[PDB]
Coordinates of C-alpha atoms in Angstrom, one line a residue:
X1 CA -0.1 -0.2 0.3
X2 CA 1.4 3.4 -1.0
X3 CA 1.4 6.6 1.1
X4 CA -2.0 8.2 1.2
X5 CA -3.7 11.0 2.6
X6 CA -2.5 14.7 2.3
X7 CA 0.3 15.9 0.1
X8 CA 3.6 16.6 1.7
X9 CA 4.4 20.3 2.4
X10 CA 6.2 22.2 -0.2
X11 CA 9.8 23.5 1.1
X12 CA 9.9 26.0 -1.7
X13 CA 7.8 29.1 -2.2
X14 CA 5.0 28.4 -4.7
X15 CA 6.1 31.7 -6.8
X16 CA 9.5 30.0 -7.3
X17 CA 7.9 26.6 -8.5
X18 CA 5.8 28.7 -10.8
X19 CA 8.5 30.2 -12.3
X20 CA 10.1 27.0 -13.3
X21 CA 7.3 26.0 -15.6
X22 CA 7.0 27.0 -19.1
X23 CA 4.6 25.9 -21.9
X24 CA 5.6 26.8 -25.7
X25 CA 3.0 28.7 -27.2
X26 CA 0.5 28.9 -24.3
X27 CA 0.2 29.7 -20.7
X28 CA 0.3 26.5 -18.3
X29 CA -2.8 28.1 -16.7
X30 CA -4.8 28.0 -20.2
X31 CA -3.4 25.1 -22.5
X32 CA -4.8 22.7 -24.7
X33 CA -3.7 19.0 -24.4
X34 CA -0.5 19.7 -22.5
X35 CA 2.5 17.2 -22.0
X36 CA 4.5 17.9 -19.1
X37 CA 8.4 17.0 -19.9
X38 CA 11.0 16.5 -16.8
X39 CA 14.2 17.0 -17.9
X40 CA 17.6 15.0 -16.9
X41 CA 20.4 15.6 -14.3
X42 CA 22.4 18.5 -15.5
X43 CA 19.9 20.3 -17.9
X44 CA 16.8 22.6 -18.2
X45 CA 13.8 21.5 -19.9
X46 CA 14.8 23.0 -23.4
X47 CA 18.2 21.4 -22.9
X48 CA 16.8 18.1 -22.6
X49 CA 13.9 18.6 -24.9
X50 CA 14.3 21.3 -27.6
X51 CA 16.0 18.8 -30.0
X52 CA 13.5 16.1 -29.6
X53 CA 10.1 15.6 -27.4
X54 CA 9.3 19.4 -27.7
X55 CA 9.1 19.5 -31.6
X56 CA 8.0 15.8 -31.7
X57 CA 5.3 16.1 -29.1
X58 CA 4.0 19.3 -30.8
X59 CA 3.8 17.5 -34.1
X60 CA 1.5 14.7 -32.2
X61 CA -0.9 17.5 -30.9
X62 CA 0.1 18.4 -27.7
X63 CA 1.2 21.6 -26.2
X64 CA 4.8 21.0 -25.0
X65 CA 5.4 22.3 -21.4
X66 CA 8.2 21.7 -19.2
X67 CA 9.8 22.3 -15.7
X68 CA 13.5 23.5 -15.2
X69 CA 14.2 23.1 -11.5
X70 CA 17.3 25.3 -10.7
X71 CA 20.4 24.6 -10.9
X72 CA 20.0 22.2 -14.1
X73 CA 18.3 19.5 -11.9
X74 CA 21.3 19.3 -9.6
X75 CA 19.5 20.2 -6.5
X76 CA 17.7 17.8 -4.1
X77 CA 15.7 15.6 -6.2
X78 CA 13.0 15.9 -3.5
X79 CA 12.9 19.8 -4.3
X80 CA 13.0 18.9 -7.8
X81 CA 9.6 16.7 -7.5
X82 CA 8.1 19.7 -5.9
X83 CA 8.4 21.7 -9.2
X84 CA 6.7 18.5 -10.9
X85 CA 3.8 18.2 -8.6
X86 CA 3.1 21.9 -8.7
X87 CA 3.1 21.9 -12.6
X88 CA 0.8 18.6 -12.6
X89 CA -1.7 20.7 -10.2
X90 CA -1.4 24.0 -12.7
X91 CA -1.6 22.0 -15.9
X92 CA -4.4 19.9 -14.9
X93 CA -6.4 22.7 -13.8
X94 CA -5.0 24.8 -16.9
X95 CA -6.2 22.2 -19.5
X96 CA -9.8 22.1 -18.3
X97 CA -9.2 19.8 -15.3
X98 CA -8.2 16.9 -17.5
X99 CA -5.5 14.1 -16.9
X100 CA -2.1 14.8 -18.7
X101 CA 0.8 12.8 -19.8
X102 CA 4.3 13.0 -18.2
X103 CA 7.3 12.3 -20.2
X104 CA 10.7 12.5 -18.7
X105 CA 14.3 12.0 -19.4
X106 CA 16.7 10.0 -17.0
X107 CA 16.3 11.7 -13.4
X108 CA 13.2 13.1 -14.6
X109 CA 11.6 9.8 -14.4
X110 CA 12.7 9.1 -10.9
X111 CA 11.3 12.4 -10.0
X112 CA 8.0 11.5 -11.5
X113 CA 7.7 8.4 -9.7
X114 CA 8.8 9.8 -6.6
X115 CA 6.0 12.2 -6.9
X116 CA 3.4 9.6 -7.5
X117 CA 4.7 7.5 -4.5
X118 CA 4.5 10.5 -2.1
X119 CA 2.1 13.1 -3.5
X120 CA -1.2 11.2 -3.7
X121 CA -3.1 14.5 -5.2
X122 CA -1.3 13.8 -8.7
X123 CA -2.3 10.3 -8.9
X124 CA -5.8 11.3 -10.4
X125 CA -4.2 14.1 -12.4
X126 CA -1.5 12.0 -14.4
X127 CA -2.8 9.9 -17.2
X128 CA 0.4 7.9 -18.1
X129 CA 3.9 8.2 -17.9
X130 CA 6.4 7.8 -20.9
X131 CA 10.0 7.5 -19.1
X132 CA 13.4 7.3 -21.5
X133 CA 16.1 5.9 -19.6
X134 CA 14.6 6.3 -16.1
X135 CA 17.0 5.5 -13.2
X136 CA 14.5 4.3 -10.5
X137 CA 17.4 2.3 -8.9
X138 CA 19.9 5.0 -9.3
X139 CA 22.8 4.1 -11.3
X140 CA 26.3 2.1 -10.0
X141 CA 28.0 4.8 -12.4
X142 CA 26.9 7.9 -10.6
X143 CA 30.3 8.2 -9.0
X144 CA 29.7 10.7 -6.4
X145 CA 33.3 10.0 -5.0
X146 CA 35.2 9.8 -8.6
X147 CA 37.4 12.8 -8.9
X148 CA 36.3 15.6 -6.4
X149 CA 35.2 13.9 -3.1
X150 CA 31.9 16.1 -3.6
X151 CA 29.0 16.1 -6.0
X152 CA 25.8 17.5 -6.5
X153 CA 22.7 16.7 -4.3
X154 CA 21.1 14.8 -7.0
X155 CA 24.0 12.8 -8.0
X156 CA 24.4 11.4 -4.5
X157 CA 20.6 10.5 -4.5
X158 CA 20.9 8.9 -8.0
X159 CA 23.7 6.6 -6.7
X160 CA 22.8 2.9 -6.4
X161 CA 22.0 2.2 -2.5
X162 CA 21.1 5.8 -1.9
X163 CA 18.8 6.8 0.9
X164 CA 16.3 8.2 -1.7
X165 CA 16.4 5.1 -4.0
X166 CA 16.1 2.8 -1.0
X167 CA 13.0 4.8 0.4
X168 CA 11.4 5.1 -2.9
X169 CA 11.7 1.2 -3.1
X170 CA 10.8 0.7 0.4
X171 CA 7.6 2.5 0.1
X172 CA 6.5 0.5 -2.7
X173 CA 7.4 2.9 -5.7
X174 CA 9.2 0.4 -7.9
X175 CA 5.9 -0.9 -9.1
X176 CA 4.1 1.4 -11.6
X177 CA 1.7 4.0 -10.1
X178 CA 0.1 5.2 -13.4
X179 CA 0.3 3.4 -16.7
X180 CA 4.0 3.8 -17.4
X181 CA 6.2 2.7 -20.4
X182 CA 9.9 2.7 -19.6
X183 CA 12.4 2.9 -22.8
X184 CA 15.9 2.0 -22.2
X185 CA 19.1 0.7 -23.5
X186 CA 21.5 -2.3 -22.3
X187 CA 24.4 0.0 -23.6
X188 CA 23.7 3.0 -21.7
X189 CA 26.7 4.6 -20.5
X190 CA 25.3 6.6 -17.7
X191 CA 22.7 4.4 -16.1
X192 CA 23.7 0.7 -15.0
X193 CA 22.6 -2.0 -14.3
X194 CA 20.3 -2.2 -17.6
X195 CA 21.6 -5.4 -19.3
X196 CA 19.2 -8.1 -18.1
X197 CA 15.9 -7.1 -19.6
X198 CA 14.4 -8.0 -16.0
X199 CA 13.6 -6.1 -12.6
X200 CA 17.2 -6.0 -12.1
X201 CA 17.5 -2.9 -14.5
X202 CA 17.4 0.4 -12.9
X203 CA 14.6 1.6 -15.6
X204 CA 12.1 -1.4 -14.7
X205 CA 9.0 -1.1 -13.0
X206 CA 6.6 -3.9 -12.1
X207 CA 3.7 -4.1 -14.5
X208 CA 5.0 -1.3 -16.4
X209 CA 5.6 -1.5 -20.2
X210 CA 9.2 -2.2 -20.0
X211 CA 11.1 -1.8 -23.2
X212 CA 14.9 -2.8 -23.5
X213 CA 16.1 -1.7 -26.9
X214 CA 18.1 -4.8 -27.4
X215 CA 15.1 -7.2 -26.6
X216 CA 13.3 -5.8 -29.7
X217 CA 16.4 -5.2 -31.8
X218 CA 19.1 -7.5 -31.0
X219 CA 22.0 -8.0 -28.4
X220 CA 24.3 -5.8 -30.9
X221 CA 22.0 -2.8 -31.4
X222 CA 23.6 0.3 -29.7
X223 CA 21.9 3.4 -28.4
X224 CA 23.6 5.1 -25.5
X225 CA 22.0 7.4 -22.6
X226 CA 21.0 10.4 -25.0
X227 CA 20.0 8.1 -27.7
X228 CA 17.4 6.4 -25.6
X229 CA 15.7 9.7 -25.5
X230 CA 16.3 11.1 -29.0
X231 CA 16.5 7.8 -31.5
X232 CA 14.0 7.2 -34.2
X233 CA 13.1 3.6 -32.2
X234 CA 12.5 5.9 -29.3
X235 CA 10.0 7.9 -31.1
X236 CA 8.0 5.1 -32.4
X237 CA 7.8 3.7 -28.8
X238 CA 7.0 7.1 -27.3
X239 CA 4.3 7.7 -30.1
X240 CA 2.6 4.3 -29.2
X241 CA 2.6 5.1 -25.4
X242 CA 1.0 8.7 -25.9
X243 CA -1.6 7.2 -28.3
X244 CA -2.2 3.9 -26.6
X245 CA -5.8 3.4 -25.0
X246 CA -4.2 1.3 -22.3
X247 CA -1.9 4.2 -21.5
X248 CA 1.2 2.1 -22.2
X249 CA 3.0 1.4 -25.5
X250 CA 1.9 -1.7 -27.2
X251 CA 4.1 -4.3 -28.6
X252 CA 2.4 -4.4 -31.7
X253 CA 3.2 -0.6 -32.5
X254 CA 7.0 -1.1 -33.3
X255 CA 9.3 -4.0 -34.4
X256 CA 12.4 -4.7 -36.0
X257 CA 12.1 -2.5 -39.0
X258 CA 11.8 0.6 -36.2
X259 CA 15.5 -0.2 -35.1
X260 CA 17.1 2.9 -36.0
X261 CA 19.5 4.3 -33.4
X262 CA 19.9 7.8 -35.2
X263 CA 17.9 11.0 -34.0
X264 CA 14.2 10.7 -34.8
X265 CA 13.5 11.2 -38.5
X266 CA 10.8 14.0 -38.0
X267 CA 13.4 16.3 -36.7
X268 CA 15.0 19.2 -38.5
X269 CA 18.3 18.7 -39.4
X270 CA 19.5 21.5 -36.8
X271 CA 17.5 19.5 -34.3
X272 CA 19.2 16.3 -35.2
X273 CA 22.6 17.7 -34.8
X274 CA 21.6 19.4 -31.6
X275 CA 20.4 15.6 -30.5
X276 CA 23.7 14.1 -30.8
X277 CA 25.2 16.8 -28.6
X278 CA 22.2 16.6 -26.0
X279 CA 24.7 16.0 -23.0
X280 CA 27.1 18.5 -23.5
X281 CA 25.7 21.3 -21.4
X282 CA 25.1 18.8 -18.7
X283 CA 29.1 18.4 -18.2
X284 CA 29.5 22.0 -18.1
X285 CA 26.3 22.5 -15.5
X286 CA 27.8 19.8 -13.1
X287 CA 31.3 21.4 -13.1
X288 CA 29.7 24.9 -12.2
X289 CA 26.9 23.5 -9.9
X290 CA 26.4 22.7 -6.3
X291 CA 28.5 20.1 -4.7
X292 CA 28.6 18.4 -1.4
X293 CA 30.2 15.4 0.6
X294 CA 26.8 13.6 1.7
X295 CA 23.5 12.6 0.4
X296 CA 20.7 15.6 1.2
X297 CA 18.3 14.5 4.2
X298 CA 15.2 12.7 3.2
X299 CA 12.3 14.8 3.8
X300 CA 9.9 13.9 6.9
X301 CA 7.5 12.4 4.5
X302 CA 10.1 9.8 3.2
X303 CA 12.4 9.3 6.3
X304 CA 10.5 6.2 7.6
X305 CA 11.2 4.3 4.4
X306 CA 14.9 4.4 4.8
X307 CA 15.7 3.8 8.4
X308 CA 19.4 3.1 8.9
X309 CA 20.7 4.8 5.9
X310 CA 23.1 7.9 6.2
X311 CA 22.4 11.3 5.1
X312 CA 24.0 14.6 5.6
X313 CA 22.8 15.0 9.2
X314 CA 23.2 11.4 10.4
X315 CA 21.4 8.1 10.5
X316 CA 17.9 8.1 9.0
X317 CA 15.1 7.2 11.8
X318 CA 11.4 6.9 11.7

């Protein structure tokens, strides 16, 4: 049984959360068919999606909207989730009180699932989740202690074994909460482990539509972390998920002829070039960003689910 009852309090002023939400060509308070895009570590919304799902979702008939939690998704993943929860509240009312899809890149999927686990109000407002390379179990490649012995808050949190990923799993968050499709790759160079095509993989959610590219395209098919978001294969799976009456991608809607690892066909030449360079700003943001030597404390609503772990203030207690 998941957390129920009232939503946790926000730590951020609402005005700050509002400033992080933008829609292309519309206000989030008056928008037709919004899709909420949640970016990856080290990026803003436009950096994650300008070269891919902002144009691609527009051509499918959605108004692209996004959050850009500062600085570049490097702060506390629990604060990044406040931006998403506030955005869902706003876009739900702003689209006529209609459920909306959420589409994510890397950490953005962890944020979405964290929000669905701990903020019950949004469960009735999210139609489906389409997550590209989500790291629900974190990654064994996060490397918070590689090179400098300090790393961004959200990098600690995305490290395998972290208090945050422990709390998500222990609270029941590795089972899908809304209809979810997870698209990922065994050759992801950022998120591992992803090789088993099974619940061991970081992108896997129980009862989700878990699509490891190599299970469809073969063991030597190669797409990396950025290509998991931008590829033509990824587009076909995401399109199926967004159109599906079940809320999940359908195996019938894609196949071996879609196994194209290059940027999605419908992107402009400029977008395809930008898609190849997707993570370049992320490295600069990380170098310039906040860094610390400990994992951020869990907020009170999550503390009971990671008792015994160690965060900045000490040992987690209930």
